[PDB]
Amino acid sequence: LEYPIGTPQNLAGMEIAAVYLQPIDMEPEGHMRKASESDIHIEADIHALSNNPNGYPEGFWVPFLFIKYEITKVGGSGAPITGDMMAMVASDGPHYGDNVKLQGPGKYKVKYTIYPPNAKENPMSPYYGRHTDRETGVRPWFKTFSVEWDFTYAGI
Amino acid sequence: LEYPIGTPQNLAGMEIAAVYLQPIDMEPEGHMRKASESDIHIEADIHALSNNPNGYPEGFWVPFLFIKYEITKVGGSGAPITGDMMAMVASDGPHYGDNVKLQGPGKYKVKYTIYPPNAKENPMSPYYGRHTDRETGVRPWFKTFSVEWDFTYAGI
Ligand SMILES: [Cu+]
Ligand SMILES: [Cu+]
Ligand SMILES: [Fe+3]
Ligand SMILES: [Fe+3]
Ligand SMILES: [Fe+3]
Ligand SMILES: [Fe+3]
Residue type, A59: G
Cα–Cα distance between A110 and B15 in angstroms, integer?
38
DSSP B120: T
d(CA A43, ligand 1 centre) in Å: 6
CB contact B129 to A (< 8 Å): yes
Dihedral through CA A17, CA A23, CA A26, CA A30, nearest 10?
A: 110
A15, B70, B91 from A52: Cα distances, Å: 10, 34, 10
Question: Closest residue of A to B85, CA-based?
Answer: A127
d(CA B22, ligand 5 centre) in Å: 38
Instruction: Name which of A56, A58, A82, A80 is nearest A69 in CA terms.
Output: A82
The answer to whether residues B104 and B78 touch, using CB atoms and an 8 Å cutoff, is no
The answer to whether residues B38 and B19 touch, using CB atoms and an 8 Å cutoff, is no
Cα–Cα distance between B54 and B141 in angstroms, integer?
7
Cβ separation B93–A129 shorter than 8 A: no
Task: Give the full edge-to-edge strand order of the sheet including A40-48.
Answer: A3-11, A14-21, A40-48, A93-100, A86-90, B128-131, A26-27
d(CA A154, ligand 6 centre) in Å: 47
CB contact B35 to A (< 8 Å): yes
Q: Which residues surround ligand 6, an ion (CB under 5 A)?
A: B 43, 92
CB contact A53 to B (< 8 Å): no
Residue type, A111: K
d(CA A98, ligand 1 centre) in Å: 6
Where helices occur in chain A by DSSP H, the ranges are none
Cα–Cα distance between B138 and B112 in angstroms, integer?
25
Q: Are strands A86-90 and B128-131 parallel, antiparallel or unpaired?
A: parallel
Contacts of B107 (CB under 8 A, 6+ apart): B73, B74, B75, B150, B151, B152, B153
Chain center to CA of B92: 15
The nearest CA of chain B is from the CA of A10 a distance in Å of 20
Dihedral through CA B52, CA B56, CA B59, CA B65, nearest 10?
A: -100
Cβ separation B129–A61 shorter than 8 A: no
- Experimental determination approach used: X-ray
Cα–Cα distance between B31 and B88 in angstroms, integer?
11
Rg of chain A taking only CA atoms, in angstroms: 16
Domain extents in chain A: 1-156
**Tally: H helices and E strands in chain B:** 0, 11
Q: Are strands B86-90 and A128-131 parallel, antiparallel or unpaired?
A: parallel
Residue type, B33: R
A137 contacts on B by Cβ (under 8 Å): 24-25, 90-91
d(CA B3, ligand 6 centre) in Å: 10
Helix (H) / strand (E) containing A149? strand A145-153
Instruction: Tell me, in Å, the resolution of the deposited structure.
Output: 2.8
A91 contacts on B by Cβ (under 8 Å): 55, 131, 135-138
Q: Which residues surround ligand 2, an ion (CB under 5 A)?
A: B 88, 97
The answer to whether residues B41 and B98 touch, using CB atoms and an 8 Å cutoff, is yes
